[model samples]
Target: ASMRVVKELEDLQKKPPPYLRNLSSDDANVLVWHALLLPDQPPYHLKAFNLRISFPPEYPFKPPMIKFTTKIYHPNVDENGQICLPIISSENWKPCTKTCQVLEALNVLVNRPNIREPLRMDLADLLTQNPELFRKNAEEFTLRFGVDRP
Candidate 1:
């Protein structure tokens, strides 16, 4: 996954995603930092979340498909780290988005859920009903599976 994202980053740097004005989140100088920081978010149960994004030959005209190989337990993320984000969907996604923006959005989803779109109803309900349990679960998951990587 790291290799793929790195390759995509390299590809993006060479040509860039047409719609984006700049690669703010995954720019050349700081993409590595963003990479490190992104995985350091909550539910931190994720020892790692490697992703692969494939652009159709036509590119920006088609949305990239992103999948992860990490254990995630959240409304917006699956055990496989498959995410449901606004930018990947038919409604909120616009051609103007870039890999950097997608990465940012995905990183945010690691800890926070799109409550409005409740992907995991059970987890969402648990969040609302037993906030304490939810907190413990998050803490434990982090301790059990997360690494203190910077």
Candidate 2:
């Protein structure tokens, strides 16, 4: 299990994911990893998000636990940083899925939100009803809570 984690970490370091400002492996736990995501896309380009992923000992056979520690105005994501992602779904995930792929999916979702099944209905409704308002509100939210911290 540790071997798998090491290999993935090596691969991740060699070919880091897009929009990732920093990637870190915990000193006490090799199975845990932390990353800082700085978006390059519109609306969230000024925002920076911190994400964490924890691998189980039975990794490859089981999906890892991932979540954001930063706040955002995305509909697929909630106040708790829980995301509505199919790639991270338990029954929908596969053993062949790589960590980098997971990161890519997360990045895509963050950049282009999925309003099909919104985790945050208020924000989602705002987006559906008034797009300009949504944009203004999102930008304000980003300015207030999502800007990269020094």
Candidate 3:
């Protein structure tokens, strides 16, 4: 089963999916992958997000820990880079789930936020009550920090 993870990592290195790539280091055994999120909607569009995917020793059976290293202004994401994602949750995770699926889910999350289960209550309130203001802040943050380089 561990061999599968290595194989998957190699596959990512050989041919990454779109903007996503393997950011693993040669001096480490950890699989640290990054995804440059490019959503096709407001606020999240034309922006890039850096995601870190780390697997535990008992991976597949155990869910991987995914966090945004890039600062994003989102209702479902906190100031400390923690994200509120259901697919990565222990209860929702399955052994058959792949890393690609998790990346795809995060892309969707940026475009369509789950306001009911937000990590940042203030951002959630702004998203729900004052959408224009929320968009303004989100867009500004994206321009300030989420700018894609190369």
Q: Which candidate is the best by lDDT?
A: 2
The global Cα lDDT (0 to 1) of model 2 is 0.83
In model 3, the clashing pairs are none
lDDT of 3: 0.76
Tell me the TM-score of model 2: 0.92
Q: After superposition, how far is residue 92 of candidate 2 from its true place, in Å?
A: 1.0
- Over 1-150, each residue of candidate 1 has an lDDT whose tens digit, in order, gives 345445666766676433222332234432232223234444563455445555544445556666654355566666666777667776776777777788667667665656566767777788788977876776676566544432
TM-score of each: 0.65, 0.92, 0.86
lDDT of 3 by residue, 67-123 (tens): 888898998888878886789899999999887687778777877888898899899
Residues 1-150 of candidate 2: C-alpha lDDT, one tens digit per residue: 778988998888878866886788888898999888777656778878888888999998898888888888778788888886788689888999998888888888888876778899888888889988988887888888884743
Query: Which of 1 and 3 is ahead in lDDT?
Result: 3
Q: What is the C-alpha lDDT of each candidate?
A: 0.57, 0.83, 0.76
Count clashing pairs, candidate 2.
0
Best candidate (score: TM-score):
2
